[PDB]
Structures are given as structure tokens and as C-alpha cells.
């Protein structure tokens, strides 16, 4: 039997958020000049001539 009051509830939520799916599009990224590019050992790669 339908009791109107007992069937009533209050539903919570967050107010007015915005969901961003992609996550790296906000990153702009650049490389050092590849002639002067260096490895883990603090010693240049592509240096022998």
C-alpha cells in the first residue's frame, strides 16, 4: 500500500561540476635540440664524430 510520506526521500548530489575526459590535451610539450640530447648517465648521446 502506497504511503506517500514514507515513500519520500531526499537525494544528494554535487552541484554543477564539469567532467574532463581527455587529460593530456592540456599539456603542451617540447624537446631540447636533438643534437644536444642526453641520457640517464649525464653524458651526451650522438656525440661520436
Amino acid at each position: 500500500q502506497f504511503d506517500f510520506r514514507a515513500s519520500m526521500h531526499m537525494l544528494t548530489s554535487n552541484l554543477t561540476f564539469t567532467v574532463y575526459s581527455d587529460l593530456l590535451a592540456f599539456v603542451s610539450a617540447d624537446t631540447v635540440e636533438p643534437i644536444n640530447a642526453v641520457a640517464f648517465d649525464n653524458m651526451r648521446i650522438m656525440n661520436e664524430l
Binding site: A25, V27, S28, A29, D30
Partner: protein, 72 residues
């Protein structure tokens, strides 16, 4: 008829390379004006007579609006 035309066309030993030079200078000069609104590194330019193309690389991925605004 005789018309004043103090400019360049073909029919000369000089016209080809010199037009290539002038287009190179023109595009090098223009391409240093897009720099007022974008950051890019000119990777390659080619000029051959009746056409020319320049490639350029960005700090990020390309969008429609950058293409449109660059074109304008």
C-alpha cells in the same frame, strides 16, 4: 601596344633560381610573422618555380582554429 613591365618572367638564364631565391626570402619573411602569435620551429622549406611549401612543428597537437587563424 607597348606596356611598362619592369619585373620578372621566364625566358632568361637567371629567372629560375632567382625566383626561387625571392620566394625563399618572401616565405622566410612571412614565416617570421606567424611567430607573433604561435611558437614553431621551421623544419623545412622548399621552393621550385611555380609552387612552394614549408612545414612547421608546434608545442602541441593541431586544432581547426589554429589552421583557420594561421590561414587568415
Amino acid at each position: 601596344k607597348k606596356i611598362q613591365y619592369g619585373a620578372v618572367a621566364s625566358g632568361e638564364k637567371q629567372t629560375k633560381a632567382a625566383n626561387s631565391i625571392a620566394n625563399l626570402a618572401l616565405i622566410k619573411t612571412v614565416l617570421s610573422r606567424i611567430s607573433n602569435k604561435y611558437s614553431f620551429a621551421t623544419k623545412i622549406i622548399r621552393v621550385d618555380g611555380d609552387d612552394n611549401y614549408a612545414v612547421l612543428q608546434f608545442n602541441t597537437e593541431v586544432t581547426k582554429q589554429m589552421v583557420q587563424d594561421v590561414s587568415n
